[PDB]
Amino acid sequence: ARGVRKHLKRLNAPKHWLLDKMGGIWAPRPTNGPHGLRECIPLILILRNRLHYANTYAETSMILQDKNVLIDGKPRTDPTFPVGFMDVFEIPKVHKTFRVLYDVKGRFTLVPIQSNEAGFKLCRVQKIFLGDKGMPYLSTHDARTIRFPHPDIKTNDTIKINLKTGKIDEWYKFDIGKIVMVTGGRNCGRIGTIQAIDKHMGSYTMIRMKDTEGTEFLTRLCNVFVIGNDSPAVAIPTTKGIRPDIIKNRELRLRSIA
């Protein structure tokens, strides 16, 4: 081409969006922002496609013009705004507060949370670097920037941020035996404990985890998010990160029409 892409065909949209192949040539293209294109969901795809508060695009706009939706405590008036992992989703007029996590099939789900919990956010430290006049900065998985961080915080740790001041009140270190959740790949969405860290000079570092039923699995270090120290700092869905096999899933499916 001669410049950036502004469209996204429906068959080319990410597969965990669960878009259906009829009823449209086009799909919404997420605007740049706190999250990337592949690992996100356009906000409209929650209000219209999922919760049916709106039923078309045009009337999905008017909900976001009068500012009925807060993301991390701020009203976003943009239908293709990228919302993603750990974002707080609060609709006041219906009194619904959610936290955006993954389910055991790598898709985004909303978990109900209490008013005592929606005032903070977990971020993953992506890098530490020296900015202007040699000052230290840290960057997160949300495209957030913090100057003068405490020297203990190192890369791959997670930090806890109050959602009004935008400052740090807690941090969790990446270690052996920490509770963790996988954010992408093919073990996305399930929760376990770290039991190995194998570094390969020049190449990717692999992590081996083990579920609460003891199933062991592997992935890359760029996909493991710490959610606490042997106890998750937040709430998690009812399945709690245990993935069935196809046979047990089939028997649970047979039981729904039963």
Binding site: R147, F148, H150, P151
Partner: protein, 109 residues
């Protein structure tokens, strides 16, 4: 494009000319539009352009669509600018405090 039929010669079907230092000049046409910038109405009326009462909302114009004077320093606009300056100082003060905290922290560590 194509240009310049002559440096005036026989070709031209038209000429444009202005009169300097004067059939004879008789008509005097009025100026349709009136000064609009705030200073434009202080040079007209000899008023100084430096005071703490520059409001100048005299409304005559001789009923001659055009007024809505520009560049007027009102009271709220003065407050706006003063507020922006008072916040551009607060940023620097809090920034220097944070730098001091971090230097002392590394000193303790």
């Amino acid at each position: 494009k194509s240009i310049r039929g002559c440096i005036v010669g026989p070709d031209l079907h038209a000429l444009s000319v202005v009169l300097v230092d004067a059939g004879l000049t008789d008509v005097v046409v009025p100026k349709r539009l009136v000064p609009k910038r705030a200073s434009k109405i202080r040079r007209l009326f000899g008023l100084p352009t430096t005071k703490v009462d520059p409001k100048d909302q005299m409304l005559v114009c001789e009923l001659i669509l055009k007024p809505k004077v520009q560049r007027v320093v009102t009271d709220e606009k003065y407050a706006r600018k003063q507020r922006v300056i008072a916040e551009k100082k607060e940023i620097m003060r809090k920034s220097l405090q944070q730098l001091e905290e971090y230097k002392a922290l590394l000193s303790r560590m």
